[PDB]
C-alpha cells in the first residue's frame, strides 16, 4: 500500500494540459481501497486466532 | 539477505546494460567520414538540456 | 457553408447600376439558407430526445 | 497672489483617495434594489409565484384564465 | 508518524520548487550569452 | 505504455518543426533577391516585399506554441519515467497521507491528442501558404524581368 | 443564483443585438446616399 | 499574474 | 469610392457579428433552461422524508 | 507606454490573460476586454459615417 | 406474488429501454447521412448555376467579372482539404481609411 | 528572440520586471529611431 | 545587460539556499524514522513482563 | 497575416469531413483521402486498449 | 450530470463571442458542493450501520 | 561537413536518461555550426560581387 500511494501522489505535479485523467489514477485508488479492506479482514482473522 | 542481494544485482545489471547500448551506438556511429553516405541535413535546434 | 453564403451575398451588394437585376443564383443561395435552417431544427430535436432517453 | 487665504489656510490633503471598492460589478440599468422582502421573497405572505428571473414580483396570471379564455 | 507526514509534505514541496528554479537558470544561461555578445 | 505514447508523439512534433526551419531559410533568400531588384513595378515589389515580410514574423509566431508544447511535455516525462522506475522498497517511498480522493484535471486522452494535432494542422498549412507566396515572386520577377 | 446570473447575461446580449441592427439600417441608407453622390 | 514581491 | 469600400467592409463585418451573436443567442437561449427544467424538488432531495 | 501600462494593470493573485511579447492570446476572454472590443468596433464604423459625410 | 411481480416489471422495463436505445442510434445515423447528401447535391446545383453565369458575362463589366472570380474561388474551400486551401484572388488591400 | 526565449518559463516563475520593461523600451526606441531615419531620408 | 546580471546573481543564491535546506531535511527524516522503529522495538519487551 | 492585411477565415479542423473508415470497397484509397497517420494509427492502439 | 452538460454547452460557442463570468464560476461551485455532499453522506451512513 | 556535423549531433541526441551527457563536444559542434554559417554567407555575398 505504501508503494502504491507513493506512485499515486507525484502525478499531481503535471502542468496545464499534460495533467491527465487516467486508468493509472483511478485503478490506483481502487487498489488502495481494496488493500484497506483486505487489511481489515486480516485483522479480524487475527482476533479469531 | 537473498532478496536484498538479488535486488542490488538487478540494479547494477540495468546500469551496465544501458552502458552497453550507448557504447555500441557510439562505436557504430564513429565509422563515418565526410564524403560518406548515411549522412543527412538535420535542422534540429540545439536544445538538449533539462 | 452558411458563412460563405452570407459573405457572397454581401459581396453581391457591390453590384452597380443596370447590372442590378434578379439572378437565379440569388434564389439558389436563399434556398441554401432555408435548407440549413431545416437541418438545424432536425438535429436539435434529435439531440433533445437523446438527452431525455439518457 | 493665491486664490484666497480660506483655500490656502484650510487646505488639507494626503487623505485616503478613491471610493471603496465595489467588490463586485454593477450595472445601474437593470439591477433592482434588494429588500427585506426580496431576500426572504419565498417566505412572504404577499409574494406571487417565483417563475420569472431577475424579478420575483411578477404576477403569475395563470389561474385567472377561465375555460373559454384559458390559454 | 503525523510529524513525519508533515516533514514529507514539506520535502515534496521544496523538491518540486528546485526543478523550476533550475529550469529558469538554464533558460537564462542558454539565452543571454548566446545572442548578446557584442555589437 | 503511456510513456511510449509520448515518445511516439514527440517524434511527430520533432519532425513537424523541422520543415519550417528550411522553409523559413528559403523564404529569407527570396527577400534578399527582392531588395536587389529594388537596387537593380517598383510599387509592386515593395508591396509584395511588405507582404512577404509580414509572413516572416507569422512563421516564427506559429513556432511559439510548438516549443511551448515540446518544453512542458518532457517535464512530465521526468515525472512519468521516475514513476516508471518507481520501485518497491526504494529510497523515496514514504508515507504521505491524505491526497487520494483528489481530482482537478482537464484531460480525456483523445482530446489531448487532437489539441496536439490542431497545433500541427495549423502549422504545415502555414508552410504551404509560404511556398505559394515564394512562387508568385519569381513569376512576378520574371514578368518584371 | 445560477438561474439569475444566466438571465442577466442573455438580456445584455439582446441589448447588444438591438444596437447592431440600429446601426445596420442607417449603414444601408448612408451607402445608398453615397452611391447617389458618386 | 505575479509581482516580484511575493 | 475608397470611402465606399471602407463602408462595405464595415457593413460586412457588421453582418458577420450579427450571425455570430444570433448563433450564440440561439444556443444559450435553447439548451440551458430547457434542460434545467428537470431540476428535482426539495422534498425528494431530502429523501421523501 | 500603453503596453507596459496594460501588463502592469493585471498582475495580482487573480487569474491573468495570455498576453505576452508575441504569439496569440488564448481565446478565453474577459468581460472588460469583450466590452472594449465592442466599443471599438462600435465607434469605428460610426466615425466612418461622418468621415464619408464630410466629403458629402 | 410480489417478488415475481417487481422482478418481471423491472426486467421488461430494462429490455424496452435497451431496444429504444438501438432504434434511436439508427435514426441518428440515417439523419446525419441524408442531411450531408442533400447539402452536397444542392451545392453542386449552385456551382452549375454559377458556371452558367460566368458563361453569359464572358459572352463595370470587368468589375462584375472580378467579383465573379473572387466569389468563385471562395466555394472551393467547402471541398478542398483544409491543409491545402488558401485564397487566390485579390489579396491587394484597396481599403485604406484605417 | 531573447524575449521569446524569456517566455518559456512557467510556474511561480512568470514575474514581470525591469528587464522585460527595458526590452520593451529598447524595441520602442529602435522603432522610433528607424522612423526618424526614414523621415530624414525622405 | 546590467539588470539581467543582477537577476542571475539573486536566482543563484536562492537555489543554493534551497539545496542546503533539502539536504538537511533528508537527514532529519532519516533520524525520525530510526527513532520510530526504536519505539516499535521497545513495545514487545514491555508486554513480556 | 499580421499587418496591413488580415482575414478571418475559418479553417476546418478535419475530423468529420472525411471517411476514415475502411472496407474492401474503400481500399482503392484515392490520394485525396485526408489520412494523416497521427490520429488513425494512434486510434488503432487506442481502441485496441479500450476494448 | 446536468451541470457537466451545461458546462459543455457553454464551451460550445463561437470565436468572437466567448467569455468567463459568474456562470462557470458558480457551476464549479455547485460541482464541488455536490461532491463534498456525496462523501459526507457516505461517511454518515457508515457510522449509522456501525 | 555541415551535414556531417548535423548528423553527428542528431545521432548523439539519442542517449537514454542519465547517459545523455553535456561535454565540450557539443560546444565545439555548435562552434563549427556557426563558423560554417559564416563561411556560407561570406561566399554568398562574394557571389554577388563576382
PDB file of C-alpha atoms in Angstrom, chain K residues 7-21:
ATOM      1  CA  UNK K   7     -38.741  -8.705 -10.782  1.00  0.00           C
ATOM      2  CA  UNK K   8     -40.592  -9.126 -14.073  1.00  0.00           C
ATOM      3  CA  UNK K   9     -41.619  -5.459 -14.072  1.00  0.00           C
ATOM      4  CA  UNK K  10     -38.034  -4.209 -13.800  1.00  0.00           C
ATOM      5  CA  UNK K  11     -36.963  -6.809 -16.367  1.00  0.00           C
ATOM      6  CA  UNK K  12     -39.437  -5.711 -19.032  1.00  0.00           C
ATOM      7  CA  UNK K  13     -38.659  -2.054 -18.360  1.00  0.00           C
ATOM      8  CA  UNK K  14     -34.977  -2.784 -18.997  1.00  0.00           C
ATOM      9  CA  UNK K  15     -35.494  -4.588 -22.303  1.00  0.00           C
ATOM     10  CA  UNK K  16     -37.866  -1.888 -23.571  1.00  0.00           C
ATOM     11  CA  UNK K  17     -35.305   0.812 -22.794  1.00  0.00           C
ATOM     12  CA  UNK K  18     -32.424  -1.074 -24.407  1.00  0.00           C
ATOM     13  CA  UNK K  19     -34.498  -1.513 -27.574  1.00  0.00           C
ATOM     14  CA  UNK K  20     -35.294   2.207 -27.682  1.00  0.00           C
ATOM     15  CA  UNK K  21     -31.534   2.771 -27.441  1.00  0.00           C
TER      16      UNK K  21
END
